[PDB]
Amino acid sequence: FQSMSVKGRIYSILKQIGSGGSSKVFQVLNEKKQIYAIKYVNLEEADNQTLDSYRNEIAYLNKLQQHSDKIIRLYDYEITDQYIYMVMECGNIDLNSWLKKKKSIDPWERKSYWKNMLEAVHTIHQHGIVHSDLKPANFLIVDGMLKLIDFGIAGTVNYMPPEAIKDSKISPKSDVWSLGCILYYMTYGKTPFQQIINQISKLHAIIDPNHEIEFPDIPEKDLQDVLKCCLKRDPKQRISIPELLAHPYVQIQ
Ligand SMILES: COc1cc(N2CCC(O)CC2)ccc1Nc1cc(Nc2ccccc2S(=O)(=O)C(C)C)c2cc[nH]c2n1
């Protein structure tokens, strides 16, 4: 019921989707009555290291615009010493809400979301970025299509690769492990160590090879292979994003 200006342009605030320290996202309308998400970050108690981290993520989001529509759109931003305003594409729902509120998934819809996850992450990898904290909440469904919102620059432990737990040690392969965990959720309705009540017992489970990960028989033997390949505990043995892109699973239907 109130307004904002970003680079000379006024936006009407429909509602706030999300709050935080010290940042917020509002769903907003421009003068053409087009819809956007505007993130606002308050820098009042933000330190130089923090500030640079933010400037860096903003820089890369802006660059990778050109290179793939599987990264969230940034149309504009206004940045001063007190705040940031980012004028971005508005999502329909984040992947995690979407999976939390889904009772199963269309095999095709899943395959199509995988293609998207791989394309976003493939991109950032091509520019030297390793997200290294990939979750469903890092993805947005926009008009049937999955988009990556964040680059890791600016549950928790479920999607964590074992090389982060033993940690000198982080490679693009760590992202593949984490994607692996997402698909697994989308295939089996849970992450690989979600059974493990206790969070230390989990951490030993994630890194211990005497712990066979289970992969129940399912109609799509390809999906089973992809999962078996991403979730190999040794990154050197694990599969690469560009290999995953040529795999029968994403290539044949
Ligand atoms: C109506 O627009 C939205 C609605 C929702 N939900 C609908 C309500 C609830 O049931 C589940 C989440 C979730 C996301 C959006 N759209 C968003 C959310 C965004 N981020 C966001 C918003 C609120 C809370 C958290 C985030 S997030 O960046 O941390 C991530 C979880 C999307 C962004 C960022 C850029 N564009 C965006 N579009």
116: number of Cβ within 10 Å: 20
Neighbouring residues of 246: CB distance < 8 A, sequence distance ≥ 6: none
* CA 151 to ligand 1 centroid distance, Å: 16
Alpha helices in the chain (DSSP H): 48-67, 95-100, 107-126, 162-165, 173-188, 199-207, 221-230, 241-244, 248-251
> What are the tokens at 82?
């007190």
Which residues contact ligand 1 via a Cβ below 6 A? 17-18, 25, 27, 37, 39, 72, 88-91, 93-94, 97, 137, 140, 149
How far apart are the C-alpha atoms of 253 and 245, rounded to whole Å? 14
Spans of all domains in the chain: 4-92, 93-253
Q: Which residue has the tokens 């931003």?
A: 77
Which approach determined this entry? X-ray
The SS3 call for residue 115 is: helix
Q: Which of 133, 150, 208, 225 is catalytic?
A: 133
Resolution of this structure in Å: 2.7
Closest CA to 32 of 52, 48, 17, 10: 10
For residue 133, indicate whether it is catalytic: yes
User: 93-253: which CATH number, 1.10.510.10, 3.40.50.300, 3.30.70.640, 1.10.1270.20?
Assistant: 1.10.510.10
User: 4-92: which CATH number, 3.30.200.20, 3.40.640.10, 3.30.360.10, 3.90.1640.10?
Assistant: 3.30.200.20
